[PDB]
Amino acid sequence: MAEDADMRNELEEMQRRADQLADESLESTRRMLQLVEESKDAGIRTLVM
Amino acid sequence: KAIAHYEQSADYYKGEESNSSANKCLLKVAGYAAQLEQYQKAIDIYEQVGTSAMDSPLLKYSAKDYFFKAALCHFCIDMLNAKLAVQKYEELFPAFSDSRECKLMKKLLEAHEEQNVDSYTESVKEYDSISRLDQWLTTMLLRIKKTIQGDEED
Amino acid sequence: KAIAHYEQSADYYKGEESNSSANKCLLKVAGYAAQLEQYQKAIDIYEQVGTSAMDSPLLKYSAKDYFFKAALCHFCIDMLNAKLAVQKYEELFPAFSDSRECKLMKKLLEAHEEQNVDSYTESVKEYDSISRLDQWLTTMLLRIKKTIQGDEED
Numbered sequence A: 001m002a003e004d005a006d007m008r009n010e011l012e013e014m015q016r017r018a019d020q021l022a023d024e025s026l027e028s029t030r031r032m033l034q035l036v037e038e039s040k041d042a043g044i045r046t047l048v049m
Numbered sequence B, C: 001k002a003i004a005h006y007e008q009s010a011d012y013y014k015g016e017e018s019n020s021s022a023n024k025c026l027l028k029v030a031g032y033a034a035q036l037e038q039y040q041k042a043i044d045i046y047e048q049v050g051t052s053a054m055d056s057p058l059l060k061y062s063a064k065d066y067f068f069k070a071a072l073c074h075f076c077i078d079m080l081n082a083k084l085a086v087q088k089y090e091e092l093f094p095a096f097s098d099s100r101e102c103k104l105m106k107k108l109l110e111a112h113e114e115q116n117v118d119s120y121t122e123s124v125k126e127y128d129s130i131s132r133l134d135q136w137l138t139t140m141l142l143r144i145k146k147t148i149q150g151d152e153e154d
Helices: A020-034 A037-048 B002-013 B019-033 B046-050 B060-069 B102-114 B117-130 B135-152 C002-014 C019-036 C040-055 C063-072 C081-086 C103-113 C120-130 C135-151
Strands: none
Touching: A037 B060, A037 C063, A037 C120, B002 B019, B019 B046, B046 B060, B102 B117, B102 B135, B117 B135, C002 C019, C019 C040, C019 C063, C019 C135, C040 C063, C063 C081, C063 C135, C081 C103, C103 C120, C103 C135, C120 C135
């Protein structure tokens, strides 16, 4: 031999990102954490009143 | 004279301390102080009635509605009283109908302070996407939008 | 003196089976009395309301916050006395609204008992969003963490 090979290689990016907006789905599921608590919080105390 | 009798009768309902009868009178006063256009008195009404409401669980989830009703009553009131009445009324700004008041109001009155109506009109519909607008609000919004527009020419 | 007025007046309302004010004025006694000075009255009142609350088919859903008020009053108590109410009370813990009563508690008991603060405080970091906190709840939050201070603060 008396052989040195030092090499590099390249990447294939994974799928599932047609557009970044997809993470806005998380902004949705934030909102259905946002839009859920006050329903019961006023529901049970609406039963109280 | 209708308004003078809502106000006079609310004085009587507060005479016997029957509060929300007077507040139902005060919306017909104050809500019709918008189209009679005395905004200075519109914001003089929702303060003393709604800061009295955070102690009440009876209306607290409603009280921030009233300090949207206090807040959006502009005659172009660009003081930080609008940035402070939202604070004296202690109000978690990550409240999720105050997201529909406070940071709503930030986009509504920063763009006026940007002098830029376009993202204003896009974000008011973004509010419409998450809470649909009604008559008194929508009329005062086109009103203040006139003020914003007539300020952005000059 | 006003709490004595509520007390004797609720004694009259009790002796007339006007159960409304009978429970109510007692709640006015205990909600301020516990924080300021009277401790066994707190659970005794919120259990007297809680039993007949569990009784009626109208009342047994108001009992959830009533035993919340019985539990979260800690009387310089480090213990699971709230959990004594858990394995007492008819929770039916697949009703999750009592998990905002006791799974809250099932965290914070061992947070206060392992003298830990970043789990105790985290409970309200997450619970402030899913329940708006009034003055009495946050004063009791500060109360149990004064017990945490007395456990930690040298």
